[PDB]
Ligand binder design. Structure first.
Ligand SMILES: CC(=O)N[C@@H]1[C@@H](O)[C@H](O[C@@H]2O[C@H](CO)[C@H](O)[C@H](O[C@]3(C(=O)O)C[C@H](O)[C@@H](NC(C)=O)[C@H]([C@H](O)[C@H](O)CO)O3)[C@H]2O)[C@@H](CO)O[C@H]1O
Ligand SMILES: CC(=O)N[C@@H]1[C@@H](O)[C@H](O[C@@H]2O[C@H](CO)[C@H](O)[C@H](O[C@]3(C(=O)O)C[C@H](O)[C@@H](NC(C)=O)[C@H]([C@H](O)[C@H](O)CO)O3)[C@H]2O)[C@@H](CO)O[C@H]1O
Ligand SMILES: *[C@@H]1O[C@H](CO)[C@@H](O[C@@H]2O[C@H](CO)[C@@H](O)[C@H](O)[C@H]2NC(C)=O)[C@H](O)[C@H]1NC(C)=O
Ligand SMILES: *[C@@H]1O[C@H](CO)[C@@H](O[C@@H]2O[C@H](CO)[C@@H](O)[C@H](O)[C@H]2NC(C)=O)[C@H](O)[C@H]1NC(C)=O
Ligand SMILES: *[C@@H]1O[C@H](CO)[C@@H](O)[C@H](O)[C@H]1NC(C)=O
Ligand SMILES: *[C@@H]1O[C@H](CO)[C@@H](O)[C@H](O)[C@H]1NC(C)=O
Ligand SMILES: *[C@@H]1O[C@H](CO)[C@@H](O)[C@H](O)[C@H]1NC(C)=O
Ligand SMILES: *[C@@H]1O[C@H](CO)[C@@H](O)[C@H](O)[C@H]1NC(C)=O
Lengths: 309, 172, 171, 309, 176, 310
């Protein structure tokens, strides 16, 4: 009579790697590298904004494409390939810095700064920004002289931030098509725009030759003041932006789906996984497993498999 | 592994032990039979569960976009980002592979340990009533029926009851 | 415990053993008695001290300020730094958690090992003069006075002296 | 029958630690590896600190009244404060942060005269923005201007060779007047041009009237190399240049100095004094520090598994 | 070591064992003799080699210059680069130090393990014919000549052959 | 009577290693995991190296006299030298460092004529700063100016479409004159503007006279996309553009070339040839390299604990 001690085994085990061996066979193993991607932006539980044709920075100044997005409220901002920020030629200085602030802003609320004018025009429009005829950036005012070649008077417009959170101030510098184009719209000779606050100063000159309106910006503190001084070539803000709360910015070609929940996103969709690592995309956003180069990393969950012969 | 049982002095595993991780295979006048040891098996599973609780379902920290797919950022910052990210990837790839390799080495040794412990428990239980044959079996030097075999697995084996008989058989 | 002694076949520790880490407790014609074993205790302490030397009092690398708390630097560069810093936080947090977990696993197994080694030392020492309880005790089959018990402790016990007596008590 | 039993020590009240296998398992003893105990001071024992206070670090080069007492200084620990300012007359430094970084590790600055003397012009330009028992200017600089209102400022050349073992920090200013007529008043009428040239640096500056500011620019001049200034107005000239002393650490804090504690790891809210490998106090630190982790506590076992009686 | 054989109950190594890692030293009427054990030696080597395969000859990671060693780039981005690089150096120095330390622990214990395994294996072979002296030797209680010694080494020793002589020498009392 | 003993090998003097619990414990054998052996040469065996010498890597695009032998080149290992210079006439490339990085891995460059022809202006702008058989200029560029002193340089437009399967490296220059007068002499009086536009790139440039210089700017033009230059003076025009060949490494080093050793990891001090996971030689490396560590030695145990005989 005898009693024998032993342990279980299966016919087909799983090969894993250890410190001393390669492809040693164990009873069972679990994958630690996620490789199943959801080819959608999972928007369940969220309040998403799909910008579509509208560029994220366009929401601030309002070209026709972004008329639908002047005030948005979301926790998940989806940027699309076909989005443009401008209509009339030009670009934002530090454009990516501004995008990065916007993507996590929670959306933007617009508020009228309350600038009024006399002795000048405010009805500046262009055929590039078409919106039932010729118009302009919805949040911006194009300032001219009363007629062709008239003198633009030295002006001072100031705005104090009433709210208890910072205000995003935007303004534009119109670079004319030619030397005499500048004198036709505004006064003769040298033009200068000065923008001041308690912690920002910068001056601006127009450079004629290639028509464009370039946009510049600052963040004005609560109870602080922005001072604009200008004698022409100045695109004035009509409204400013106040951030709402928290959001996550995504760049993607993936469709939104409000029937799946997710927290990690990339250009190719959503990653839903409890696993520590992923081989799906090295560029991700949100709360994600860490990217690895390996396709699979099997963690042993059973003993060394020694089958019967 | 480190403990010499699984893939060591015990030749191979039993595919017919579907009831647990470790077990007993007796042989007497009534025939052979196999039973799984709950205590050793649960101990092993709990430890592997432990590993899973650590690695699976972690709360990852948030990261934002720092570059742009639709509008290439300034070349200098872009290159630094690319250099940083790839270096992170290399570290994380290294960490991941090492983690798995190290954990697996420990897991196998852990399973081997639990086998060794169980074997040793039986040996100390059987006292002078049995000799180990070197293949993981215990030659019982008395007659041990199904209830007696039970009492070994159950850990209720009284060695005094069978001592005199077994000493006579061991010496003759 | 990988070695199955501490929190294994030894049911529990001894709160009365303020002497050291590992020890012997004996019963005879003169009563109970507890004593520490220096060799094993020092072996375990020495190893734990070894881990502490590796982790505590390290020389570190100097890092300078690349950031400005009073004057906001360009957000482009700022966001890259913040990204890098957070990624470093993620890496060191992992490293630290894993280091401590791995070390603790080992320390427990290491201590357990020392107990087993001491128990095995005593087993080989006692030869055919004792039998194993199963609870960490050795049932001695001869009369072993306080001097005889100490001989077992300080490794001078001569099994030959008691063998005839032991074997006949074992039948 | 006689018996000898083997066993181990235990306490009734052990410490719970984590392993690879188990959460909150009880061991006999454990020691912390994450430092959480902060000292709300900048520990300056054994060190030579400079608390810049109202003086901004860049101010040490040009010398507004706030920085008079730090025109020259020797330090191994430079402390910046929130209330520190660099300027008295409106204006900014070019690449301000880059300069701040080289100065923080300079070991302090030593000043030396550049030997510039002038003839046929005024040297005593001053402003009510920089007060020092009346209208004054930057201590290390000279505001050059014509002998009287509207007089022609003579075309000048001023050159300085670095006669030193190490690089000289050369500074100069461009003065942008409030109006054209003001520029005509202080200097001559006509195009104003300033060129700065070393063997590694070449850049020309024209003033931009309308702004009312003095902007500073800088270069490092190699040993035996020469910086040549060419100007005909709007030029804020150096009287002195800077030389670095050795090595130092820069610190940004609002924490008071404390000569009675010793440390090598500093941050916004004080000093971290520790031998522990990790710290959960501040993610942003300077000097020789434990590595930041997001865990409050990571207990390292220093004893066996604890199994009470 | 974790297993108490190497630097444990076995006093010291044998400098004359050049034919392997683990061995047998016997004493009998014909004299002394030392022989290597192949199975145990190769198991320890295979495991060490496994470690070397993981660390030596690996495909290295790709590298590119972001600095300029001839003409210093702008200070700010230059300082960011240095900061990031030094942080990488910190991480990899830690990784390397720890990896090697952790491996060396396992390596020493692994080798100790194999010594214990070979010891326990022999113990099981001899059954009731031998006792452990506590120094790593087995006192054999029957005449074991050079061929008998050989059978223990190559695992063909049949304990049944020697049991009766052994028990007569082991149990040196009257059995009633 | 008879007895058998089990034991293990040892040596008289073993090798000290570090463990989790112990420092300088002696094992039977160990191996180095940290490389410290440097080769003071650039190992170029089995490679097609390019020792740029006097010629700066960026110079290969615009072509100063020192880069004549490198205007088109084919390499898998580009070696930059300390004495290398990108220019003859004073100036610098904007984004120079990121362009250097692109060129280092380009596999070399091929040149193609952009096919710009000109009417009503002069094309033969030269300078004695770029001497090459008299007063010459950048070989891939054209210095455009008025027909005579002070004449009005006409407003002009030049467009080039990438006709290839890969990106075109477009280069242009802005000439900043010594003075207002000199700008007027070369290009006529009045202000000057240069505008460069592709479907991805849009920038304007005005010259800032004061100190003689030509500053260079660049973009990558996508296949089938067009670059448009509009300018009324102070414009340094491209004649040729560049196309990359494939794959390469770029090293900055003064180490001599050696065609008798093979290597894949390079740095300023030469070549690192190793199969080890770590190195303590140099933190700035190019190629396939061990990771830099600050420790000089990390001995890995390849044997058991050493317990010598007594
Ligand atoms: C309400 C009102 O307009 N009141 C004026 C008052 O402004 C004016 O005082 C002076 O005005 C002149 C205008 O040219 C300057 O602005 C003076 O400013 C000073 C200064 O900053 O302290 C005086 C100083 O001596 C000047 N430095 C020189 C000449 O080197 C500077 C300097 O010109 C400017 O800073 C350059 O931008 O300006 C200011 O005191 C008086 C006339 O005295 O008349 C009132 O009606
Ligand atoms: C000490 C002294 O006064 N010597 C003068 C000397 O200046 C002058 O020589 C000419 O000076 C002019 C600048 O006024 C140029 O530098 C001339 O050289 C070149 C050059 O090689 O760089 C000649 C070249 O033909 C020019 N290229 C053109 C027109 O496309 C350039 C070019 O104009 C400038 O570089 C643009 O910034 O200049 C140089 O010969 C002589 C008169 O010949 O008189 C001495 O007394
Ligand atoms: C082997 O491990 C796998 C995990 O890889 C286990 O598979 C899981 O099985 C449960 C049901 O018991 C399912 O709910 C899960 O969805 C499965 N997970 C995965 C990732 O597939 C499996 O149970 C294990 N097998 C044995 C025999 O224990
Ligand atoms: C980043 O650090 C490097 C060195 O690690 C600096 O580069 C050079 O360092 C050497 C030797 O230490 C000095 O002799 C030189 O002055 C440095 N420059 C060059 C071109 O070799 C570098 O200065 C640091 N970067 C910054 C922005 O400070
Ligand atoms: C960095 O990598 C991204 C993704 O691979 C690529 O699109 C981009 O061109 C790279 N940027 C630079 C500056 O090399
Ligand atoms: C980086 O983080 C700090 C707080 O740690 C924050 O104040 C700062 O604004 C951040 N930088 C950017 C560019 O968002
Ligand atoms: C154990 O560690 C603790 C905390 O680090 C320490 O205070 C104590 O003195 C140590 N020793 C004992 C016996 O508790
Ligand atoms: C010892 O290690 C070295 C490398 O460090 C190796 O060449 C050799 O194979 C090893 N063995 C012996 C017996 O020297």
């Amino acid at each position: 009579d005898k009693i024998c001690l032993g342990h279980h085994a299966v016919a087909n085990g799983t090969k894993v790697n250890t410190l001393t061996e390669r492809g040693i066979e164990v009873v069972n193993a679990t994958e630690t590298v996620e490789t199943t991607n959801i080819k959608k932006i999972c928007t369940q539980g969220k309040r998403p904004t799909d910008l579509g044709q509208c560029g994220l920075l366009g929401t601030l100044i309002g070209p026709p494409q972004c008329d639908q997005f002047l005030e948005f409220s979301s926790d998940l901002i989806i940027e699309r390939r076909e989005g443009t920020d401008i209509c009339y030629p030009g670009r934002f200085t530090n454009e990516e810095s501004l995008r990065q602030i916007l993507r996590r802003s929670g959306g933007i609320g617009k508020e009228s700064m309350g600038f009024t004018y006399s002795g000048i025009r405010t009805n500046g429009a262009t055929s590039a920004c078409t919106r039932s005829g010729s118009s302009f950036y919805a949040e911006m005012k194009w300032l001219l002289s009363n007629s062709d070649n008239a003198a633009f008077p030295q002006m001072t417009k100031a705005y104090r931030n009433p709210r208890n959170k910072p205000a995003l101030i935007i303004w534009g510098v119109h670079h004319s098509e030619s030397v005499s184009e500048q004198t036709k719209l505004y006064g003769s000779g040298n033009k200068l725009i000065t923008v001041r606050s308690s912690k920002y100063q910068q001056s601006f000159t127009p450079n004629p030759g290639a028509r464009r309106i370039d946009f510049h910006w600052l963040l004005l503190d609560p109870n602080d003041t922005v001072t604009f001084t200008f004698n022409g070539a100045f695109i004035a803000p009509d409204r400013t932006s106040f951030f709402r709360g928290e959001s996550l910015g995504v760049q993607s070609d993936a469709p939104l789906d409000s029937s799946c929940r997710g927290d990690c996103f990339h250009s190719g969709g959503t990653i839903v996984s409890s696993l520590p690592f992923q081989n799906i995309n090295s560029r991700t956003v949100g709360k994600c497993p860490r990217y690895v180069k390996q396709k699979s990393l099997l963690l042993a969950t059973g003993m060394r498999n020694v089958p019967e012969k | 592994g480190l403990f010499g049982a699984i893939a060591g002095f015990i030749e191979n595993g039993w595919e017919g032990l579907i009831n647990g991780w470790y077990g007993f295979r007796h042989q007497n006048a009534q025939g052979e039979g196999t039973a799984a040891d709950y205590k050793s098996t649960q101990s092993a599973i709990d430890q592997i569960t432990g590993k899973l609780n650590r690695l699976i379902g972690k709360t990852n920290q948030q990261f934002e976009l720092i570059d742009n797919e639709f509008n290439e950022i300034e070349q200098q910052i872009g290159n630094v980002i690319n250099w940083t990210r790839d270096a992170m990837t290399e570290i994380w790839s290294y960490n991941a592979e090492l983690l798995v390799a190290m954990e697996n080495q420990h897991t196998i040794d852990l399973a081997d340990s639990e086998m060794s412990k169980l074997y040793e428990r039986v040996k100390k239980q059987l006292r002078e009533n049995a000799e180990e044959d070197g293949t993981g079996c215990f030659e019982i030097f008395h007659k041990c029926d199904d209830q007696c075999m039970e009492s070994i697995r159950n850990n209720t084996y009284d060695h005094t009851q069978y001592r005199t008989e077994s000493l006579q058989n061991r010496i003759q």
